[PDB]
Design a protein around this nucleic acid. Sequence first.
RNA 1: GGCUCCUUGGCA
RNA 2: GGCUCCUUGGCA
RNA 3: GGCUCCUUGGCA
RNA 4: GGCUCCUUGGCA
RNA 5: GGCUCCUUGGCA
RNA 6: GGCUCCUUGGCA
RNA 7: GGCUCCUUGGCA
RNA 8: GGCUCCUUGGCA
RNA 9: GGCUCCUUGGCA
RNA 10: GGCUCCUUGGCA
RNA 11: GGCUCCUUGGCA
RNA 12: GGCUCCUUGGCA
RNA 13: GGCUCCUUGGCA
RNA 14: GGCUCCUUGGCA
RNA 15: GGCUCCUUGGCA
RNA 16: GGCUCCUUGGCA
RNA 17: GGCUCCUUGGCA
RNA 18: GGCUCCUUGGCA
RNA 19: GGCUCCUUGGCA
RNA 20: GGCUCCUUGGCA
Lengths: 138, 136, 138, 136, 138, 136, 138, 136
Amino acid sequence: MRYRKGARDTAFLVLYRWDLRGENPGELFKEVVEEKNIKNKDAYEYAKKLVDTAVRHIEEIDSIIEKHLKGWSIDRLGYVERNALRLGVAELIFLKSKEPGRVFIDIVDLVKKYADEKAGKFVNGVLSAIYKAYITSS
Amino acid sequence: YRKGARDTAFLVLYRWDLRGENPGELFKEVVEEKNIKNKDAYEYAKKLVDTAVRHIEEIDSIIEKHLKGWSIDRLGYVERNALRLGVAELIFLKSKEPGRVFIDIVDLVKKYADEKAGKFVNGVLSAIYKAYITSS
Amino acid sequence: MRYRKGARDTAFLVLYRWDLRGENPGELFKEVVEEKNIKNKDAYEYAKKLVDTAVRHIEEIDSIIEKHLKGWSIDRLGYVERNALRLGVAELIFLKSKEPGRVFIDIVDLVKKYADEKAGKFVNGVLSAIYKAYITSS
Amino acid sequence: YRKGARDTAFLVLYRWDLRGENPGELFKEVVEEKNIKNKDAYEYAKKLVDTAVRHIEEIDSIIEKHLKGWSIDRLGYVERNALRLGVAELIFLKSKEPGRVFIDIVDLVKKYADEKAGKFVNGVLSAIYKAYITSS
Amino acid sequence: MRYRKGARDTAFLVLYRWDLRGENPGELFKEVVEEKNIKNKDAYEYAKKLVDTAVRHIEEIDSIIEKHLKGWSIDRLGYVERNALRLGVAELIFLKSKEPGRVFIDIVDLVKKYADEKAGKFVNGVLSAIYKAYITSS
Amino acid sequence: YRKGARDTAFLVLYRWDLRGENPGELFKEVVEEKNIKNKDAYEYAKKLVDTAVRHIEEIDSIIEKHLKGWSIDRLGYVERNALRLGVAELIFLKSKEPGRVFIDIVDLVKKYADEKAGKFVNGVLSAIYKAYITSS
Amino acid sequence: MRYRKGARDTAFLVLYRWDLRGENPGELFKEVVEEKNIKNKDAYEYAKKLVDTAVRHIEEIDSIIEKHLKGWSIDRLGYVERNALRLGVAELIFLKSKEPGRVFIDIVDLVKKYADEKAGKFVNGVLSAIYKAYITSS
Amino acid sequence: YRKGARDTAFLVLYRWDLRGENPGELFKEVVEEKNIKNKDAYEYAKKLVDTAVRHIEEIDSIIEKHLKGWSIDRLGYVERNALRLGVAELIFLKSKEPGRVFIDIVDLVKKYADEKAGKFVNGVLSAIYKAYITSS
RNA sequence: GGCUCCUUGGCA
RNA sequence: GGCUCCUUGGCA
RNA sequence: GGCUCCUUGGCA
RNA sequence: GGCUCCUUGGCA
RNA sequence: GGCUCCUUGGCA
RNA sequence: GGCUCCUUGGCA
RNA sequence: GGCUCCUUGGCA
RNA sequence: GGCUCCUUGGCA
RNA sequence: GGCUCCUUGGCA
RNA sequence: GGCUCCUUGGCA
RNA sequence: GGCUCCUUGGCA
RNA sequence: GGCUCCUUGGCA
RNA sequence: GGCUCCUUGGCA
RNA sequence: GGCUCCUUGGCA
RNA sequence: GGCUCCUUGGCA
RNA sequence: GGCUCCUUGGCA
RNA sequence: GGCUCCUUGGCA
RNA sequence: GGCUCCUUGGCA
RNA sequence: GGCUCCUUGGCA
RNA sequence: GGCUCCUUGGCA
């Protein structure tokens, strides 16, 4: 239902700081949850599942997105762009979201919010290409 | 352009006193998070953090002297680090705009804590500066 | 025999419309006969005799029923109640029906049919009182 | 509650066009015969009859125009009077429920005459209304 | 017959206000009857009998319901819940309703209406337990 | 959130002027009956009732002055108490949203009585407020 | 949008030096652009179009302004006044500016800046008369 | 009034050495651009330019001698022409205010180029003048 | 050198 | 060593 | 970037 | 979204 | 909802 | 038509 | 007879 | 009527 | 109308 | 305009 | 001193 | 000080 | 002292 | 909570 | 509940 | 020969 | 055909 | 799509 | 954005 | 920018 957006925001913060600060994912999860004053169970558990599905499988995801960068190493992107793409790939593919378009909207929203419009368009294009590659992979 | 630099430096010093890691990496992190564009803000904030880190023990002594008997370790991270930054710029960088420094610092205190801590930091800073004037 | 009920129905319609519409009794008789598709001679002639015995003697009848209304003017009743009482008095008294109870049953039936149950009980009571007054001159 | 009112009004108009007496007395007669209980049915039917009687000649003209050349006097009493009522309510009372008016009227035609007259009255009424739409 | 529901509603209002406002039961009965525009005799008299059977016997009833609250004092419930339970016990037990299920339906309906769903479920459970205790008192 | 508070206060004042019991208990009763959830509505309505009860005689005087010669005791409970509440909030609480107060009050009058009383209360309230503007 | 003022300044320099130094318009354009450190494309192209529209049509313009000098030969004016009037006529008439008043403000500003107040008033009056003559063909 | 005349003359000589056109026309252009009002400034600057143009080759020789082996064609236009003007006024016009000439010239060098060229021109000019003193 | 001041050059 | 006003030019 | 005025759309 | 409002309903 | 009075269907 | 119910319709 | 909620539409 | 979010262009 | 900004000059 | 530090003038 | 016309700073 | 204004800090 | 827009978070 | 769209049932 | 309707009845 | 009411079922 | 009450889940 | 709401921030 | 009250600047 | 002053600079 509705908790999904908040869960995605939390997960994005956790991944962003995990990449940037190199701190433990669980500890950063505690930090983000405490500072955001998260209470409701669904959002908490969904965010935890998102973060866990992002951390486990991280390299597979990195490879997946690095395939669509046209030979460009993933460190050549922005922190926001990169991590948001990671979360997006995790949710869309690894958890097989039944609401792909919704995930697109929310993710792109997060990218616009934390970075800017152009980053949003970039992430949108890349992730769209990735999902187009995924859906017809079967 | 100095205000944002002061906010930066404050956050960096805060994370240093909290986590305990290397100030440079923390600086990189804070800079990355707030998206610092302007060059002067970067340079300035960096100079602030460096100045604070080099003189840190002397700064702590100067602050503790005006704490009215308190141990500096017992202050809140916000008050303590804001006082650190304030003393750093006012004394060791010899800021030619002390009033503005007081402004920015106290405002920072009121942002990340209650105004109750704001007037306190203002008072301690005032005492420290008044002592610094008659020092030399 | 059997034609009596139909004759009574026809006569009742004729009287009801005579009182209500103020139209000529003979013309209304033609109307009712034509619209009911009456054919059989006995019913036709019996209905005609009923209507004629109702029209001639009408005021005498009105007085008779008005005696049993306990001072109440006859216009204070319903059209159905009034006219049915008129027909009933005509048949019972003026033609001296040899089948009084039968006339009662049929008349009360007509009253229930064209108005309602309570009107039927009312007409029944009134007409019964009238006939009780009529039979004992002895 | 409108249906019974329409049946009432139809019977009244019919007896008016037939006998030729005063519409009010006829209305009283019809009301007495069918035993009208509800107030709204009475009021409504009365308004219908009044509206029809006031505008009667104009109504006859409007109807006759769509008769395809026929004289309105040559129509059956049922068809003619039902058309009268229909035109009265649809046009002069500006009914906001035209479809329902068509329904009730045509049904009335099918009750007191064959459906053969029903489709006819439906057609004439449809033509009249379609003309009324583009009138103003 | 049908007047029972209305009677129960009236009685419930009277009890609710009797408990809340502390005003005289008869006066409040007059108030509720006047404001609801109650006319029909059966509803009036039935409501009066319900209220009277509720007021007289009130403490006995209170004890009865307080037995099933598992040691919980009756003032710990809501006004609606409490008073509706009082009326329910009065009707089911003291007047020995021959239509227990009907009383259940109507009472629970009143509880849902004046409070909420959960209050309805609560009252339902409690009253059901009470009636289960009553029927096998034989 | 103010509207429900005004309805509350109105009902409370009404029951006070009617029964004559203690306003606090009546307030508890009304609050219990309407199931007030929100805190601000409770607090507000309570402040309204208190303000009205404290200043009640002065309020009655102010209202009676604009009644055009009538005795305030001769007004309907609805009109009288609604005027009481209106004057209380508009004058003694110095409401910064007078138009909205007029709205809510007049609406309350139209709910528990005819609109005929509504325009009247609106007029009296308008006169009172216009007088209050030029008072100080 | 905003580039217009800068374009007008550049054009004015080019015309002033074209009249004074007699050097090639394109070369002087290169000089002014290089020395002003002009980069943004809109300003560059707009200035180029202004200069080109001034050079081509130059004699027509000269005649136009010479009509409003009341028989006075155009060489009797100042360099600033003359050339600014040329640019003004070019922009207002030949390019048909949709922002005439704006052009007036900027041109008069340039005249005040490079010469003095009185020159500004003079140019203002003359150019205003010219535009008044231009706008009314009917 | 001499300073502006020197700036004028410098610009004129510069444009001469750059473009290669006739010094008189260039003088007219520069005078027109800077809006020279005062008569003495005009006359003076004109005398400076004329004196420089007449003696130009001798001036170039004198300058080149003190260049420490450099070709005069390899100097920046600013340094070269400022030196030209300086030598012209100091030597051929026999200025009675040499210090002031040094001032104005060096300042002109610092305006249209970096001070790095300023000290250089000052040095060369000093050498040239010191040589001129012992010449006769 | 004890007063009131003014113009002005270089310079952190 | 720190500013004021303003001009031109580059971008949010 | 911030404020504000229209204007072409999709709106709440 | 959201007030006044001339009009027709829907649910209870 | 609540209130006033009358039908229909079906079950005893 | 003695009398209970279920589901609906219309109604001041 | 009197309420709660809500939809469409006519006008500012 | 008042309030407002975006979007296509042009302004203070 | 404003503000910041990457550059270069005139005035105090 | 302030201002740090060396100057040059010159007025009552 | 006197005379002709233009700046700068600061105060209303 | 009589006009047109702009930037901006603290504050109920 | 009363708002606008928006972000996050808790619930109907 | 309000509107609305499907969907699994019991329905009127 | 509730219209059209191809079909079979029931009651009167 | 023609009406009132009502049940089941075929189709939108 | 149109209207509608609840209920199991998923949406704007 | 909306509204209210228990919390905390950015913009005007 | 409004706004109460003390300010600082600065433009024609 | 309406208009008064104070102190200076340059100038036929």
